[model samples]
Target chain A: NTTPIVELKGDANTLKCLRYRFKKHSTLYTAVSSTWHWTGHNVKKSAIVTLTYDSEWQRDQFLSQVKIPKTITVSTGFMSI
Target chain B: NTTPIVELKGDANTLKCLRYRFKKHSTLYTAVSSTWHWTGHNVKKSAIVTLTYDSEWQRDQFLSQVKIPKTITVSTGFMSI
Candidate 1:
């Protein structure tokens, strides 16, 4: 079986926003969590949001319906190795 | 469906080690990726590794068989919020 993975990288707060956005919907395939990193000089924190859907179709639809902020970087894949 | 989510927080290199570790085992239910954060004046980076398995039993077995480093922090959940 295959799972659709979407990785969103940005500010921790920004990532949390996506998590909140997802909560409004009842349809789910399960999985949405976060991690963070600090940017240089400013000692700022950034975040990465990982989300999984039941299928690619479900993921694509969710993406289309939701307007992801311009600041966050988005990538799709199963693993980062 | 229920997706088992495991969050590991630690160094980037340490998290990457897990990515490599999971690669050796093809029996996956899907999902293992990373994100990172920075520590104090040392400017060191810490990582968060997220993973999902087929079932809780599978997750438990995987955890029991693998020896996680003492430095990394582990948590179980779907979201931080």
Candidate 2:
């Protein structure tokens, strides 16, 4: 089955939406971590979102919108939410 | 009272053990955004250990043993574990 990448951040912006599936069973479990490398300005503007699920039946969800003034690197863990 | 940082990766190297406490009852109750940066090699090599607590009394604990080959940076979220 195919899942759609719903753009929560309006159509005007070129903000990309990506999603990767994870399983809670077998040898295929995904663990994700995120980091925002801010070159200048306030570090308080950064954010980390963690959406967790217990078993395979439950689905994890994460959505966010950020106003990035300058170029910043968002390094995320392997798994998708 | 001061908390001790446990060496999840043993004492042979310059692997520093740092601690940052967080009060879940206060700032955590609000909607916050945070991020952590990590730099290294081979994607599966890095690990993120998360120790979570319920109330103010329940202290989160994290223990691990791993081998760090290079000078990799482990950037953690402000609210420590």
Candidate 3:
């Protein structure tokens, strides 16, 4: 749980696209959990990604380097239960 | 790295936004490495995020759940470097 979990907000269609991209490719690390929910409106979608790394820099490096579309929204909080 | 190293491509301005968003927030997992490169011209920016996780699901979950903007591009390959 201490690991970093990033929240991504976007349309389901767009989110699904990113999901498959990750599915098709990966590094030494694995994709832990990727879940989504319909937020606010039926069209809106939000997903949470829980990731891990050996060093804090590895984590920060990903945070700093990873790029998301301007259309999709990104945050660092978890989905509200 | 076997872990999922996702590549995000977008305008430098747009990519920076996602980078900062992750900088602000994270889960138990720290962001390991988030690095970006100017792939083409001065405008296009590409970043590589090297992540880790306990369960493969955790890693995949994030990959599937992460939502990038439509303007931004998503890929599973590392930086050309």
Candidate 4:
């Protein structure tokens, strides 16, 4: 099991900003509600942000912090599509 | 009570590219930032984008145009990501 992919072209829905790495007080993993099957199909919409750790010696903590944040600035706009 | 949401799935650390809407000479909206709150306890890391128009006139004024044929052939990657 090795799931890790990041590809973004531009101009489709247009909202692309990605970054990863976290470990201080770790506890960040996002999917919101869940819905991601892929390849075979079934992707209603997938939202994920992950990086968990609640002791156990910090789960061997590696600390990097960032999980997600890479160029995203365009505020206020919504009517349809 | 209200916290509209969207999801995208592929891999961790990847921008899912969700789409909100906007209108004329208008402004766009994006989470640019701001985490989320839901489920069992607490959550984090969620960004969004939107669009809106000012003036309120039908917001009437339409003009559509698109034409790209400038010897297109550009492929480059990584300036920071």
Candidate 5:
């Protein structure tokens, strides 16, 4: 258990670092809102972190590091269109 | 029919507005990388947006507006921990 970096500015490069942390030492959980939370441990330090972004390019950059599965749910908020 | 805001700083409060937009008008698609791209239509304007984050709080804040289904797959990059 440790303190957390409450906020961060994310992009493709930073996302790779985060992905490495998650792979090496952390428990990650996604909330209903599609937000990600990480509890880090053992590998380097024990802490928490949350990610956010400021643009579509940044989002795309960060997400490119993740592997999304097929057939995910489309939110009602999204599907109305 | 319009241009897009290429970047955005997202937080819970702003997420609500984005959610409202998604609900009102848009076609959303998630890429293999878990990045979300939105193609917006007649509600306010026609445009594209990508979402990213800087903190867990912000990610959680944004996700709270979404509804995630149960039984999603964990990524190999994530499960290594």
Candidate 6:
């Protein structure tokens, strides 16, 4: 069996939008959060958040709600054994 | 408040793939199924399936499992009142 996984990375505002979408669909997932870090060379920071959906429809629906800015990168994969 | 809604349409085989993904992530949604019909003109059949996720993470995770073929049409929206 295989499950889907999507990863997104962006700044605070982008992550905020993602959080809003997640709360709206809270019945679908187990959890939601982001991993952030600060680089020594730069005072700026960013975070990568992971969104896990149980179905394709759920994933696609969330994607449609927000625009993917250049600052954010989206990736997909599967969990199989 | 708004929730994410994803709509998908495809043939039986395509639908099967979607179902498998849904089952893999069953915790995310309330239900999963297709609306099918037999076309009289061509004797062909297809169905449209709708998936709703509780959060962005749930949606993203399900999307990662499979490849989206050209035969399938995907659309997204928010269920806001």
| TM-scores for candidates 1 onward, in order | 0.46, 0.19, 0.35, 0.17, 0.19, 0.38
Candidate 3 stretches greater than 4 Å from native: A38-43, A47-55, A77-81, B1-81
lDDT tens readout by residue for model 1, B1-81: 456667777777877776677666546425564453322212453457667777777777777776678877877644221
Model 2 misplaced stretches (Cα beyond 4 Å): A1-81, B1-44, B60-81
lDDT by residue (B1-81, candidate 6, tens digit) is 545656576686777676765666666654443443322222453455656668757766656654567887876554431
Q: What is the lDDT of candidate 5?
A: 0.29
Show model 1 residue runs off by greater than 4 Å. A37-45, A79-81, B1-81
Give the B-chain TM-score of model 6.
Answer: 0.61
lDDT of 6 at A36: 35
Q: Which 10 successive residues of model 5 chain A have the least lDDT summed?
A: A72-81
- For model 4, the DockQ equals 0.03
Q: Write the per-residue lDDT of candidate 5 for residues B1-81, one digit (tens) a residue.
A: 211112222233344355455443222312111122121221332222243333334444444554432222111111101
- Give the best candidate by DockQ: 1
lDDT, candidate 6, A23-65, per-residue tens: 7666554444343322221245245565566876666765666
The residue pairs that clash in candidate 1, if any, are A10-A47, A36-B36, A37-B36, A37-B37, B10-B47
The 10-residue segment of model 4 chain B with minimum total lDDT is B72-81
Candidate 4 lDDT tens digits, A4-60: 222222221222223222222235332221111222121322333222233323433
lDDT of 2: 0.26
Each model's DockQ? Answer: 0.08, 0.07, 0.02, 0.03, 0.03, 0.02
Rank ordering of all candidates by DockQ, starting from the highest: 1, 2, 4, 5, 3, 6
In model 5 chain B, the worst 10-residue window by lDDT is B72-81
The CAPRI-style docking tier of model 5 reads incorrect
Give residue B53's error in model 1 in angstroms: 19
Q: Write the per-residue lDDT of candidate 3 for residues B43-81, one digit (tens) a residue.
A: 434443344344455545656655567887665422211
Model 5 B-chain TM: 0.26
Error of 5 at A10 (Å): 19
lDDT of 5 by residue, A1-81 (tens): 111112222343444355454443222322111223221111332122243333334444444554432222211111101
| Residue B13 displacement (Å), model 4 | 29
